Structure formats: C-alpha cells, structure tokens
Design a protein around this ligand. Structure first.
Ligand SMILES: N[C@@H](Cc1c[nH]c2ccc(Cl)cc12)C(=O)NC1CCN(Cc2c[nH]c3ccc(Cl)cc23)CC1
Ligand SMILES: Nc1nc2c(ncn2[C@@H]2O[C@H](COP(=O)(O)OP(=O)(O)NP(=O)(O)O)[C@@H](O)[C@H]2O)c(=O)[nH]1
Ligand SMILES: [Mg+2]
Ligand code: NA
Lengths: 167, 469, 166
C-alpha cells in the first residue's frame, strides 16, 4: 500500500531536540505523551496529496552512547540534523553529524534537512543568516521550529519527505 | 456514619476533596492531579496504605516541592488535633463518672494512629531509599532527627526508636546462593599472567562472565536521583549522574575495543578468527541474559569500520551469521523483540539502559508540570507516576545477583581497557575507518595480503563449559 | 506476563521481612526493623511461565493490628508466617487466617503456612502440630530459613501455584 519513510533525528543532547518529534506525533491539541506506547513514533500523513507513513527514530537521551550512532543512523532514509538556536556548540556539531551520516550511508547525497530549534526564551546565539549560509553550503533546506508553539514542526518533516521523494 | 474531622481552619488536611484541589483517573483511587496538600493527604491516607504511591512520590516530588518544604508538610500532617468531649461525655463527667469517650477513641484508632503511622512510613522510606536528600542538606537531616526523636506516646514508640537507629546507621554507611558458581575457565593466558591477557588468549566464556559481572555491577549502581529531571542530559550531568555515565562509558569503551581488535588485525584469516571469537562472546552474553553485552557486540558489528568488511563476514560460519542476525533483530522496529525478550527471561539479567533514558526524557519533555483547572494550578501527578513506573522497572532488575565468581585480574584488565588512548573521539574513529579502508579497500581497488600478527593458535576452545571433579 | 499479588502476614519478629528480602535480593537481614508496610516486585519464571510477583510485606506489631483490612482486600494469596521457636506466633496464625477469610468473604483463599527460622536448633513448635493445622486449612506447610535460604523459593512459588490454580 502506502510508502513508509524511515526518518532519523540527530543532534546534540540537553537542548530540547525531543520536542520536534513529540510535537509532530502528539495529539497536536492535547499536551500529553506516553513514549512507551507502541507506535508513539509512527504517523500517517498526507504530503502534497500523497498519503504516507512516517516512522521516526529519535534516540534523545542516548547521546553518551556514541558508539551506537552508526547503527541507529544506518536505519534511516532521511535525516533531520537539529541544533538549538541558543547553543552555539550544538550548531558547530552539525558538520560532524553530517559527515557521519554520509559515511554510514556511503553516499555524498543523503536526504537531510537542517533544523534550528527554539527550546526556550534564553537569548538566541545562532542567527538565521548563519544557519542559512551553512545549509546552502551543504545544498540542503533550513527550517526553524519552536519547541513550544509547534511552529515549523510540520514544515521540517514534510520538507524532509520531499527531499527523499526528489532524490 | 463517617468520623468527623478537625476544622479545616486548624488542620489543613481536612478540606473536602473537590475538582479545584484533586482530580482522579477514571480498588484504591489513582490520582491524576492535585495540590501538594492533597497529594500529601493521600500519601498518608487514613483508609488505606499505598506503598507504590510512597515510592512514586519520594522518587519524583522534587520537581514540585523542595525537600525542606516536604518535611514541614509531613510534620504538619502528623500533628492532628483530638476532638472535644461529646454531649454524652459531658453528662457523665457532670455526674462524677468516667466518660465512655467513644468518638474520641474511634478517632484515635481509625484516623490519628493510621495517619501518624503512615507519616512515619514516609519518613522511613525517605531515609532508607532516598537518603541523598539528607547527604546533600545536613540541616534537613538535623530536622528529621529532631522530629523523629521527639515523637511521644506509646503507640508509635517501636517505630520511632527503630527509625532513629536506621538514621544513625545510614549516616556512617553479603549474598547467599542456591548453588556454587561454576569454575573459572582458562585458555592460552594462565592465572596470574596478566601481561598476556587479550581478546584471543583469555577464554571466551570467561571474558563474557567477567564482563557480565562488571556490567551488572555498573547497572545496579545507578540510582533514581541520576535520572529524574533528565539530569544526565544537563550541564551538571557529571555531578548528578556519575554512576550512569560510568556505565555508559564502559559500554562505549568495550564497543570501541571490539572494533579496534577487528580492524587492527590486518591478515584476513586472523581477522575472521577475531570476529568469530567476538560472536562467541555474544553467544555467552545471550546465555547470561546480559543484553547490554549483546548490544555492545551488535553496535560494534554495525559500526562504519566493521560493517563494510564483506570479505571477513563472507568466511564466518553460517551458524554464527545466524547468531549475529538474531541479536541484531532484537533492536529492529524500535527494540520490539528486545522488549519482549527482557520481559520473558528469568533474571539475573543486565538490561540495556538506553531505552529507559529515552523514555524518561520524553515523558518529562512531553507532559506539562501542571494542569490548569477552575482557575487553579494542580500538580500533574500522572506525569510523575509515568516516570516512576520506568524507575521502578529499572530497580526491579537491579535486585538479582549473578552466581559467578570474580577473577580479580581479568576484572582489572577490563576495567583498565582504554582503546582510544590519549586520542580524541573524532581522531580515533577516523583512524578506525581508515584502517578498515586499508585492510579491505573500496572496489575496484584490489584486496591486498597482510602478514600474520598472532604467534599463538587461533582455534577457539568454544563456549560450552567444562567441569572437572 | 501474569501479575500475582502476594501478601506476607504473621506476628512481629517472625521473619516476614527477612524472608522477603532473601527472596528479592539473596541477602539475609540481621537487624530487626519493625515494618509498617513495604512492597517489592520480582520477575521470575515459575513452571516455565514468566510472571511478575508483587509482594506486600506487612506489620506484625500489635500496634498496627487495626490497619489490616486494607491490605487483605488487595491480596490474591497469603503467606502465613510463624517462627518455629515462638509458640505465641504459632497461636497467632489462626487470627490471621480468620481475618483473611472474613475480609475476602471466602473459605477458599490461596494460602501457605510457613514455619520460619528452621536453622535454629531450639524449636518449640513441632512440625507435626503445624502440619495438622495446615491440613485443617487445606493448605501446604513449608519450613523456611531466611538466613540459609532453605525453603524460601518453595514457600513463595508454592503460593503462586495456588493462585494460578484458584
Ligand atoms: N544477505 C546477506 C548475505 C551475507 C553475506 N555475508 C553475511 C554475513 C552475515 C549474514 Cl547474517 C549474512 C551475510 C548480506 O548481503 N549481508 C551484507 C550486510 C551484512 N554483512 C554482515 C554484517 C556486518 N555487520 C553486521 C551486523 C549485523 C548483521 Cl545482522 C550482519 C552484519 C554481510 C554483507
Ligand atoms: N536465625 C534466624 N533469624 C531470623 C530468620 N528470619 C528472621 N530472623 C531474625 O529475626 C529478626 C526479625 O526479623 P524480621 O524479618 O524483621 O521480622 P518481621 O516478621 O518482619 N517483623 P515485623 O512484623 O515487626 O515487621 C531479625 O533479627 C532477623 O535477622 C531466620 O530464618 N533465622
Ligand atoms: Mg518486617
Ligand atoms: Na551559545
């Protein structure tokens, strides 16, 4: 039947990365979650008139298991590389995440999107223009998201699915 | 009829339940949300005990109440006023007779004594299982000692004297088995010859046993204080989650050691022997229910440097391919088969901790701290119950010890393993990948030959145990 | 995984807590810290079937004697423990048996009679007297030592089997 896309979320820990998938998969309109529930990470969606199933792997909290990253990454067809807009170190980490994905997938052209996540009201330290320039140097889209209002969340995942479809 | 209660003006815990102060889930009730006063009332309720709720509350309360404030509130809960004499008592006294005091005696027996005992049970559990609050705040400990040491009256005396002693023991602070542990197994390396210890010279059975003892001890040392509030992900993680981080760093180091053993063995035949030996260690991990160990091996086999070694895995015996495949399948579909296997085996076991960490973090991040109802903010207790269900599962697998004997030299060998040396992570993992490219170049580059590096026999002794008399 | 709610009852000091902690942790507790109410969980395979034991460890001291109905309502099966060197604790067994029957309104509650401290030489309750009582209840009698582990798994897992066949 419908196509299933295996998406993988990667990025620095401790800076709200998990809010992206929680807000997507959530009962959009009731602020609640049980991650232990079978298929709290699967969602049927319609993108450009075509119904598909998203299977999202977000191992948030396991960042210290650094030698497991290759195995987790190999499961994915497309990747969201996430940094926090108030944490410059998480932005500087993006280059090495992208290089690791390219190595694991053995491809110089892996579907991926750069996501700048606003996880609190602390002062932004990565400007939009810096992140746009980085994304353009890689040839990938840039999406900014809010961890509180759900803004940008659908755009991040749907943009990635379009990158897979157009690969 | 029900017992009458003190006036809510003199005793705050007698206010009636309403949706403005407590909400229940849809046979004791399960609380969805409430004020801190209502949570403490139900924590120490006169009609029933709720040991699960005591554990849940003491594990998670610091997200909504400070330790000093909790102690003040349970002391307030303990100090219950007694009712005045009734009309029948008054009339007896006016005649020079002793009153029956029926209502007073019932209130003592059915309200005061159960509530007071349940307050003491909170204190006992707090000191026995969550003593870190008192290690980190000496004044909190002084207040607890003073409270317990000044409870009067004979109904509580046995437990007050006991709790006083328990506190004093905790301030200055042995296994028996159904059988004997199996005999320690040796291969090329002999007892005391630590300088020859290595992947292929120790017995693969004993490698798996000693790593299982080490990894079990690391698993058992992690306390809930290292998990609640997602503190292992935050800036102070080294302060707040040291046992968890030590456990994860061991797992990472062993995975990297497996990868390094493989790719630094440049001769193809020798490298096949190395990979085959690691799969035998994985087989013994499976037999021991050491799932952390199983996934350490699987992670190494699916790493970028090892996964691409097609010439090596082509020569692995088909049965070992099947062992590795069924271990890999445990992690597929979001660990579906792993979760089912963990819930089916007979402990002792060593769980993989990573799934617990992701579920605690997402439960914290995906649920609100408070629920707003009728203009009031109620503590969202359902969210805390979900976190404590996970910490309770962790603790359940921490109880059962392995019936295996420690070998101090093999233990020390694996404790001191340091495959990265002084290199930084990126440096080292790039080195491993470049070694992989050296020993099995990308097509269409030809496969080179390399000299042997091991002077001893490569034949495995196998993983079925031996038993002399 | 089937869940079983077990409750351990009996007079103060007979070893209810020591028995439970030996089962859960393989450790013998030397101290006598009177219990108010404690609860433990254990995953274990019994007769080839995995289950989850919820074990409630109750108060034996007489000062808590008015607080028992609430835990007897929830329990599926009861370990009724006395100490073989304490005749008063054996005489207290029938009061627990009768209260459980009243609360659960049943003549057919899963139970096991446990004579603990069987590592001690100085016995005052003979096995025959306890076995006679057990037969009158229709339940098995198992002698245990929380100190040596003798009989401990047998007592708890026999109770599980009686809940499973109930
Ligand atoms: N259909 C098979 C046939 C086959 C040839 N060689 C094999 C070795 C093992 C198995 Cl089971 C199958 C084969 C295939 O083409 N496999 C390719 C990708 C896997 N690698 C082995 C590998 C490396 N790291 C791992 C970690 C986990 C797991 Cl499951 C396997 C591995 C071989 C090449
Ligand atoms: N020799 C021996 N001593 C035991 C045994 N079981 C318990 N004890 C000892 O008896 C004392 C009381 O044990 P405990 O488990 O606290 O009893 P309890 O029945 O739980 N008491 P309570 O009803 O007050 O909670 C402790 O000193 C303990 O070490 C046993 O099998 N053998
Ligand atoms: Mg006890
Ligand atoms: Na910054």
């Amino acid at each position: 039947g419908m196509t299933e896309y295996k998406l993988v979320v990667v990025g620095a820990g401790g800076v709200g990365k998990s809010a992206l998938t929680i807000q997507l998969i959530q009962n959009h309109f009731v602020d609640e979650y049980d991650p232990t529930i079978e298929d709290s990470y699967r969602k049927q969606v319609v993108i450009d008139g075509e119904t598909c199933l998203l299977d999202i792997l977000d191992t948030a909290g396991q960042e210290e298991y650094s030698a497991m990253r290759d195995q987790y990454m190999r499961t994915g067809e497309g990747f969201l590389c996430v940094f926090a807009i108030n944490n410059t170190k998480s932005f500087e980490d993006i280059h090495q995440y992208r290089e690791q994905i390219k190595r694991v997938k053995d491809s110089d052209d892996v579907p991926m999107v750069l996501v700048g996540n606003k996880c609190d009201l602390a002062a932004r330290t990565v400007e939009s223009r810096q992140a746009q320039d980085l994304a353009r140097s890689y040839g990938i889209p840039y999406i900014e998201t809010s961890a509180k209002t759900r803004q940008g969340v659908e755009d991040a995942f749907y943009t990635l699915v379009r990158e897979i479809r157009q690969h | 009829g029900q017992m009458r209660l003190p006036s809510a003006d003199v005793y705050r815990f007698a206010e009636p339940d309403s949706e403005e102060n407590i909400i229940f889930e849809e046979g004791i009730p399960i609380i969805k949300a409430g004020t801190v006063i209502k949570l403490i009332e139900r924590l120490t309720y006169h009609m029933y005990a709720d040991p699960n709720f005591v554990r849940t509350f003491l594990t998670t309360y610091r997200s909504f109440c400070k330790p000093q404030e909790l102690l003040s509130l349970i002391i307030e809960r303990f100090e219950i006023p007694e009712p005045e004499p009734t009309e029948a008592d008054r009339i007896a006294i006016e005649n020079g007779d002793q009153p029956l005091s029926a209502e007073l005696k019932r209130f003592r027996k059915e309200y005061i004594q159960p509530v007071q005992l349940r307050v003491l049970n909170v204190c006992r559990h707090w000191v026995e299982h969550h003593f870190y609050d008192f290690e980190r705040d000496a004044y909190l400990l002084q207040r607890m000692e003073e409270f317990i040491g000044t409870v009067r009256g004979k109904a509580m005396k046995k437990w007050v004297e006991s709790i006083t002693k328990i506190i004093q023991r905790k301030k200055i602070a042995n296994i028996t088995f159904q059988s004997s542990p199996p005999t320690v197994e040796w291969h090329i390396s002999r007892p005391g010859h630590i300088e020859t210890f290595d992947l292929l010279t120790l017995h693969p059975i004993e490698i798996a046993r000693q790593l299982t003892l080490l990894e079990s001890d690391l698993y058992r040392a992690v306390q809930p204080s290292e998990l609640v509030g997602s503190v292992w992900t935050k800036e102070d993680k080294e302060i707040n989650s040291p046992n968890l981080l030590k456990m994860i760093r061991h797992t990472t180091n062993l995975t990297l050691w497996f990868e390094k053993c493989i790719v630094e063995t440049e001769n193809l035949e020798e490298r096949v022997a190395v990979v085959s030996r690691i799969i035998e260690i994985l087989q013994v991990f499976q037999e021991l229910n050491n799932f952390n160990g199983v996934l350490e091996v699987v992670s190494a086999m699916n790493s970028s440097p090892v996964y691409r070694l097609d010439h090596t895995f082509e020569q692995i015996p088909s049965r070992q391919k099947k062992i590795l495949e069924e271990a890999h399948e445990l992690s597929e579909d979001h660990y579906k088969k792993y979760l089912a296997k963990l819930r089916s085996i007979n402990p002792p076991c060593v769980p993989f901790f990573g799934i617990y960490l992701t579920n605690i973090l997402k439960t914290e991040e995906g649920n609100p701290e408070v629920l707003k109802r009728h203009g009031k903010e109620l503590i969202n207790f359902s969210k805390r119950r979900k976190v404590a269900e996970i910490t309770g599962e962790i603790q359940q697998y921490q109880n059962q010890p392995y019936c295996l004997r420690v070998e101090s030299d093999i233990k020390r060998f694996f404790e001191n393993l340091n495959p990265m040396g002084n290199s930084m992570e990126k440096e080292f993992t790039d080195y491993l990948f470049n070694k992989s490219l050296e020993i099995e170049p990308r097509n269409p580059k030809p496969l080179p030959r390399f000299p042997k590096k091991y002077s001893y026999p490569l034949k495995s002794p196998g993983v079925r145990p031996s038993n002399p008399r």
